[PDB]
């Protein structure tokens, strides 16, 4: 019985396989031939010619089939270099056949697995690059035989031996198909050739763009190449005219001739691709002059300049980082991830995209931005930031940005801001409470303005980080002021605090009235009657005389008998009192919360002095319905006239009373008031003295 025996070590270096084929065919059709393999793996190479003991060989029962017997001998990887003692025991029809002892080394006879990953590509020069993946577990170099067949108009078959994992085929023929097969073999020793790998077929097109796509950025450069074939002829690169979106012939200055068949266009300083309806890419066309083939090259230019803004809370608890994806929606499908590395140190002068970055989770809001809260935060640690725009055509990284939390702290508005006008100085003094913050190095900004529908805000800055209150100069001492304060870092870092709550001062009389009201009298009582009611008549003080307010009017009376006594009139502007003494001195006082008016008017009533006349003439000259001149002459007697008081009223009218005190030096006056010529008027001139009001002068 004859056997054709082939033995090889399995590609995994774990099993030694012996395949056996009986010779010749079918003299054995009804016998159970049991083939037993006995193998030995000695562990010590001892130079002693001692025969191996018969109990040392391990017996392997081989799998025998109708086509042959396969023997599976487990060879340890550590013993792949050892001498494998081998012999066979074949028993058939009661007869046992023993083969002579065989010695072999499993490592020398290895059949590797077929090469995998047979990729196919076109180089920028227009060459046809075959590539495949080497077996990473082979402890020996592998020699590869590559069989590629060119399915062009002429069928070309080539089988090439290579030690590398790639092969190059020259002159890519456009519109041609290439199928490649690669098999491996150990370079050194009697290695057994691996079976051919799966054939990889690559069919070229009439126009070949390589790279057919470029995902690039704004300002970046993209280079596209072409092998243009018209019908059966390859268009020369000199004849290749490039077009972008078929609406812009790329200038021939941008044409670079890689070869007589390869024309190259290189875009430089690329602008972000405007979305062309459903096109988010710039279509780059290889054209034989004007004959633009229906296929093009895709150019993707994205704007990776996204600003990310970060803020630190006043409780110093969290960072709030935000940014907007506005430059990202141009490309549908791009997945953007902020990648952060927190450098333990402060941020570098040049923030760098750190290889050890961590994924960060951020939320798109209703405002269109993405917030990124960092917690816990590290004060002196450099937080290197950048977005990773993972597009299907490649991942794009925003320029790395690093943030130190201190310079992005927005302050808390100070608490309990108080606004008030200091008394007797009128200084609006404002006090506020400093919120909790490091170093208290806070530059405070206040804003103040009058209370109303529209507050004309006035601001002031506080550079002293120690100040807690300040007094301010305001225009109206009796109008309500609204005050708000905001604070920031004195160094200018961080942010400004929100403006504080509106602080309202309380209106109070900062000082007493400054002048008493002008008061005249309505003279009630018969002349024959010694008692005569004197109806004092004054007017409320102005905002300047009252400053803020007059809470009451006090009329102080003085007599020789009753001495001096004062009568509070309160808010009333008139006072009727009886005249009983020859001299009765009257003074009306305007009183506010701080007291009476300092300087007050006085008026004396005297029976003897009421008879004295200092005026001899008085004349009413009507200038118009809005003015009349009163002209009068005063006595040559040295009358110490305080002032003259002009009395004018409508005759027959007891309520057309009007009066006016004028200086005693006046001889002619202009009464500007609505004047009706129809009615008769009583113009009265009153000489007023120390002793009282002298006898007046009246003209009708």
């Amino acid at each position: 019985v004859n056997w054709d025996i082939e033995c090889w070590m399995k590609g995994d270096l774990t099993l030694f396989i012996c395949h056996m084929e009986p010779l010749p065919k079918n003299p054995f059709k009804n016998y159970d031939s049991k083939v037993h393999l006995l193998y030995d793996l000695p562990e010590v190479i001892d130079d002693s010619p001692l025969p191996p003991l018969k109990d040392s060989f391990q017996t392997v029962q081989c799998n025998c089939s109708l086509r042959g017997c396969e023997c599976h001998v487990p060879v340890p990887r550590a013993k792949l270099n050892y001498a494998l003692l081998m012999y066979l025991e074949i028993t058939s029809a009661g007869v046992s056949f023993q083969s002579p002892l065989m010695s072999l080394q499993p490592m020398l006879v290895v059949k590797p697995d077929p090469p995998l990953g047979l990729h196919m590509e076109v180089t920028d020069d227009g060459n046809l690059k075959i590539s495949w993946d080497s077996q990473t577990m082979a402890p020996f170099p592998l020699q590869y035989q590559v069989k590629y067949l060119e399915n062009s108009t002429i069928v070309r078959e080539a089988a090439e031996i290579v030690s590398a994992t790639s092969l190059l085929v020259d002159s890519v023929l456009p519109g041609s198909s290439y199928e490649v097969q690669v098999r491996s073999k150990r370079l050194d020793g009697s290695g057994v050739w691996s079976d051919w790998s799966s054939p990889q077929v690559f069919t070229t097109q009439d126009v070949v763009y390589f790279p057919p796509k470029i995902l690039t950025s704004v300002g970046s450069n993209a280079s596209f190449h072409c092998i243009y074939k018209n019908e059966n002829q390859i268009i020369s690169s000199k004849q290749i005219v490039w077009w972008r979106n078929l609406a812009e012939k790329i200038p021939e200055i941008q044409y670079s001739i890689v070869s007589d068949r390869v024309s190259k266009v290189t875009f430089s300083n690329l602008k972000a691709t405007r979305p062309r309806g459903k096109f988010t890419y710039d279509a780059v066309y290889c054209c034989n002059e004007q004959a633009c083939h229906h296929r093009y090259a895709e150019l993707y230019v994205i704007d990776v300049n996204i600003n990310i803004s970060c803020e630190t809370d006043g409780y110093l608890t969290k960072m709030t980082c935000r940014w907007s994806p506005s430059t990202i929606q141009s490309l549908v499908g791009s997945t953007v991830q902020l990648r952060y590395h927190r450098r333990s140190l402060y941020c570098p002068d040049s923030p760098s995209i750190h290889p050890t970055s961590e994924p960060k989770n951020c939320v798109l809001q209703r405002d269109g931005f993405y917030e990124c809260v960092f917690q816990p935060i590290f004060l002196l640690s450099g937080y290197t930031m950048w977005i990773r725009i993972n597009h299907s055509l490649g991942s794009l990284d925003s320029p790395p940005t690093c943030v130190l939390p201190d310079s992005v702290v927005k302050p808390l508005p100070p608490s309990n801001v108080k606004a008030e006008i200091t008394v007797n100085t009128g200084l609006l003094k404002v006090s506020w409470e400093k919120p909790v913050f490091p170093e208290n190095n806070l530059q405070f900004q206040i804003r103040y303005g009058l209370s109303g529908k529209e507050i004309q805000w006035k601001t002031h800055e506080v550079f002293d980080a120690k100040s807690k209150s300040a007094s301010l100069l305001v225009s109206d001492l009796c109008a309500v002021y609204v005050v708000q304060v905001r604070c920031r870092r004195l160094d200018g870092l961080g942010y400004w605090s929100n403006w504080s709550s509106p602080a309202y001062t309380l209106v109070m009389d900062v000082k007493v009235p400054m002048r008493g009201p002008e008061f005249w009298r309505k003279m009630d009582g018969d002349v024959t009657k010694k008692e005569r009611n004197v109806t004092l008549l004054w007017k409320p003080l102005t905002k300047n005389d009252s400053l803020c307010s007059v809470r009451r009017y006090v009329v102080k009376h003085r007599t020789a008998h009753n001495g001096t006594w004062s009568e509070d009139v309160g808010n009333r502007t008139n006072l009727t009192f009886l005249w009983t003494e020859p001299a009765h001195t009257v003074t009306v006082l305007a009183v506010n919360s701080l007291g009476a008016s300092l300087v007050n008017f006085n008026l004396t009533f005297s029976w003897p002095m009421s008879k004295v006349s200092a005026v001899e003439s008085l004349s009413a000259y009507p200038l118009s319905s809005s003015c009349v001149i009163l002209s009068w002459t005063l006595s040559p007697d040295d009358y110490s006239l305080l002032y003259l008081v002009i009395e004018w009223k409508i005759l027959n009218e007891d309520d057309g009373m009007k009066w006016l005190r004028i200086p005693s030096n006046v001889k002619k006056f202009y009464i500007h008031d609505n004047f009706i010529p129809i009615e008769k008027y009583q113009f009265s001139l009153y000489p007023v003295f120390m002793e009282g009001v002298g006898k007046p002068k009246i003209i009708n």
């Binding site: 816990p376 004060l379 640690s381 909790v436």
Partner: protein, 141 residues
Amino acid sequence: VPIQKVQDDTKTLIKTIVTRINDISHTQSVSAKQRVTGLDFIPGLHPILSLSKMDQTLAVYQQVLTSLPSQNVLQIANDLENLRDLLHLLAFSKSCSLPQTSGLQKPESLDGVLEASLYSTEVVALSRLQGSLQDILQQLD
């Protein structure tokens, strides 16, 4: 980097953490005189002088508070890792080439007290580190 900004940075950040601890420990006003048993593995009954000794005290500080389970504490831990690195840098800025050896601690009694008295442990921790940084800021001048 200039060292004056580093020094001012140290002073500012330490007083910021002072504010942090102060207002966190608001519901935790302390009486510093009481000694409770079992937190001896916290020194601090002493002035701190040398970069090595303050450094190691701070390392132990970190280590003991690692047992503390909170979040405000976690931010303070970030603060102290920053401060520890910067004190390495300041010791370097001293131009003293003293080797920077570290470690050498045993986390057993700490964990016994941890499983014992988390309340006291955290409060004495905050208070004693307060005093520690107080003496430190005294010593920086």
